[PDB]
Amino acid sequence: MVKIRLARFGSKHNPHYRIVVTDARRKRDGKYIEKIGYYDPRKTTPDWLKVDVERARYWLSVGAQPTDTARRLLRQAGVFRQEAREGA
């Protein structure tokens, strides 16, 4: 059972979730096997998604199921496929 999703930590200080790899759902405190991505729902500038597609790819490589949100962030972090700046 490996799934990557957003980990809500901030309670009343800074709203930020990480794209971490844990079970289907927390049980008592919430723990993951490792942290591959990071997410920050900030409505200021387009620069809050920070993932290590390499580690985030380790999980997607072990049949890791990313929720619809973390799934759309693994594609944003350039995880499903490499990205480049063609035309130059």
Side-chain angles (χ1 to χ4, degrees):
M1 288 197 115
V2 286
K3 259 126 254 228
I4 292 164
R5 59 114 100 161
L6 269 108
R8 197 250 212 68
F9 316 105
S11 78
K12 315 209 101 84
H13 333 302
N14 180 38
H16 61 76
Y17 304 70
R18 275 221 270 288
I19 335 181
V20 106
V21 221
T22 172
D23 298 78
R25 241 211 258 168
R26 58 95 86 178
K27 297 157 131 138
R28 242 190 267 192
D29 56 288
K31 252 153 63 215
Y32 45 76
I33 291 93
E34 250 229 71
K35 179 256 286 247
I36 64 182
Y38 173 87
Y39 177 98
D40 218 346
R42 251 295 146 197
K43 248 194 143 149
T44 47
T45 61
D47 266 303
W48 45 255
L49 187 136
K50 187 127 245 86
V51 139
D52 213 27
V53 27
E54 204 167 44
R55 244 287 95 71
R57 170 142 187 162
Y58 165 43
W59 295 115
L60 273 164
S61 168
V62 313
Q65 244 141 79
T67 173
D68 292 355
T69 332
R71 173 225 174 170
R72 244 155 132 77
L73 303 160
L74 288 155
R75 52 159 294 192
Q76 198 68 227
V79 185
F80 305 172
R81 58 104 104 69
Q82 290 213 358
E83 184 141 10
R85 224 63 224 161
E86 222 61 9

